[PDB]
């Protein structure tokens, strides 16, 4: 949904 996720993912 948000890039803030794929960024904090790993």
């Amino acid at each position: 949904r948000f890039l803030r996720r794929i960024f904090f993912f790993f």
Side-chain angles (χ1 to χ4, degrees):
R1 197 173 194 169
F2 45 87
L3 308 123
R4 245 162 180 191
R5 142 169 232 80
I6 66 179
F7 133 92
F8 200 69
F9 217 112
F10 64 102

